[PDB]
Amino acid sequence: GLKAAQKTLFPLRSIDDVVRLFAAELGREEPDLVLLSLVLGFVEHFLAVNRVGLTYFPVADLSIIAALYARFTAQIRGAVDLSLYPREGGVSSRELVKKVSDVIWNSLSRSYFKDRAHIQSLFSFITGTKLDSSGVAFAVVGACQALGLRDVHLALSEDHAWVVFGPNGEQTAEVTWHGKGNEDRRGQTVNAGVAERSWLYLKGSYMRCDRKMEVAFMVCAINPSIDLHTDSLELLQLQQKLLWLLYDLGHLERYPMALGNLADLEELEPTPGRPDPLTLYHKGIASAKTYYRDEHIYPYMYLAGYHCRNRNVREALQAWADTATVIQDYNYCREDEEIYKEFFEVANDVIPNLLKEAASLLEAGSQGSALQDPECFAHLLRFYDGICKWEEGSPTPVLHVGWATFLVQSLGRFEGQVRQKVRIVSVPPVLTFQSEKMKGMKELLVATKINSSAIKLQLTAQSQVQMK
Numbered sequence: 001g002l003k004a005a006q007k008t009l010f011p012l013r014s015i016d017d018v019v020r021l022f023a024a025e026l027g028r029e030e031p032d033l034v035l036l037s038l039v040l041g042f043v044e045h046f047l048a049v050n051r052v053g054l055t056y057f058p059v060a061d062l063s064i065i066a067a068l069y070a071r072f073t074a075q076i077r078g079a080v081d082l083s084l085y086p087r088e089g090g091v092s093s094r095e096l097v098k099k100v101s102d103v104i105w106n107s108l109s110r111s112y113f114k115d116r117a118h119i120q121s122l123f124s125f126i127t128g129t130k131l132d133s134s135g136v137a138f139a140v141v142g143a144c145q146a147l148g149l150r151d152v153h154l155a156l157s158e159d160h161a162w163v164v165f166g167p168n169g170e171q172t173a174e175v176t177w178h179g180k181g182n183e184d185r186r187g188q189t190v191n192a193g194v195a196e197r198s199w200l201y202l203k204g205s206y207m208r209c210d211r212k213m214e215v216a217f218m219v220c221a222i223n224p225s226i227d228l229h230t231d232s233l234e235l236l237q238l239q240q241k242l243l244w245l246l247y248d249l250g251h252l253e254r255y256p257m258a259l260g261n262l263a264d265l266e267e268l269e270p271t272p273g274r275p276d277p278l279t280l281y282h283k284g285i286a287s288a289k290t291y292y293r294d295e296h297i298y299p300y301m302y303l304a305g306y307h308c309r310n311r312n313v314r315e316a317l318q319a320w321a322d323t324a325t326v327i328q329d330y331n332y333c334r335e336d337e338e339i340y341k342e343f344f345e346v347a348n349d350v351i352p353n354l355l356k357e358a359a360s361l362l363e364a365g366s367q368g369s370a371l372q373d374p375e376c377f378a379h380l381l382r383f384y385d386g387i388c389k390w391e392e393g394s395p396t397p398v399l400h401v402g403w404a405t406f407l408v409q410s411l412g413r414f415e416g417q418v419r420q421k422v423r424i425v426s427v428p429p430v431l432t433f434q435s436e437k438m439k440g441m442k443e444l445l446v447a448t449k450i451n452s453s454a455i456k457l458q459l460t461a462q463s464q465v466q467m468k
């Protein structure tokens, strides 16, 4: 349109007015992605990018939003000539989807920082011709909606986005980049990534959005950061209000990371009358088990982060052990570096800091430590084992660093008499290792004295010692 009914709430004068606009669109046949993203982007522009407004909330006048909306839709409609792409009866062709992706891609500024903040929305695309990676995929979907292509939907993994189209969403197409300067796979399917068991494509258990999940995505995509020290509290509150609206309407049911995002917000600002963060984290894991075969990593990472912030050492290590149990059924590929870096920091920064604080109290003489709990030691081992198994599914190993020095250190935080209580059982607390690297370490892990050189040899597959 804009249709008449889409315009009656303007001007938007408050974050509550924005929520009413999302509620109205979520009540329609198909919520208007372009309208909603433009509004979120406009508000974020004046609360996070250029804070020049003279009122608390940057009043959103219909004349401004309508002009931006008409600019987008006319750009897309003028550049994508549907007459050239006969549609098979509610089915978009791969050429048509590629054409929409090319129109978005070719409109982007030739040079900018692609990981800058606040370039996620259609407001940034229209005013700045800049988008970040997943913002390109979202803009393709909004453009397809504007063109009447009801079968084109956003597909989301835990670190990438693309589109699905055709009957039941059976065709996939890459429409944006991943990482930096990698392949130009635009227009290809994701079948190779699915078949290779790379985490980036979730073995095919990725999210296939309907339009209301596409609204949930843009709300998660809100970035309240003003700088590295300061968030906009008004943006955070808007994002939290919008996530509760989607929650109430049932649209986070199949969106684990949105439930974790909402829990993280509730931790900073508990909404009176709403469930606790811990309930939300477990709902996210429950969603991942129900809809995605328990193939997602972040539901457990959200939970581990919570337990870590609250110093529940046992429960953090349990959640990290669960994260590794998910990752072990993937095969490491270079495109998976983002989750690799997260595991690397957990192993080499987060866990050492937690166990160091535990060790200091225990050294003073205080009993009942997590360091005295063989279930805790077993979770630490399962965490390493899953990461090793993941790596073993790759082609070329050589994953240096972090791993050996802090593995040895973390092992030594537990006394021999605790480590010795874990039973490591082969198939065909109790632990079964899946990785060949940890299977070979079993007797080194329960020695009274941790043999640092032998453990490093085994973890690095180094076969030789210093000549002298």
Ligand SMILES: Cc1c(CN2CCC(Nc3ncnc4sc(CC(F)(F)F)cc34)CC2)ccc2c1cc(C#N)n2C[C@@H]1CNC(=O)CO1
Pocket (backbone or CB within 6 Å): 134, 156, 157, 158, 159, 160, 161, 217, 220, 257, 258, 261, 298, 301, 302, 304, 305, 341, 342, 343, 345, 346, 349, 350
């Ligand atoms: C909680 C959390 C976050 C937050 N993060 C979670 C994923 C969210 N993503 C998305 N959210 C919603 N929709 C989509 S859709 C999509 C794909 C698309 F973008 F392509 F679209 C992505 C995406 C973005 C916010 C980061 C690192 C975390 C944790 C917890 C832990 C631990 N334990 N860690 C590891 C760190 C390592 N180093 C440390 O110091 C401390 O722990």
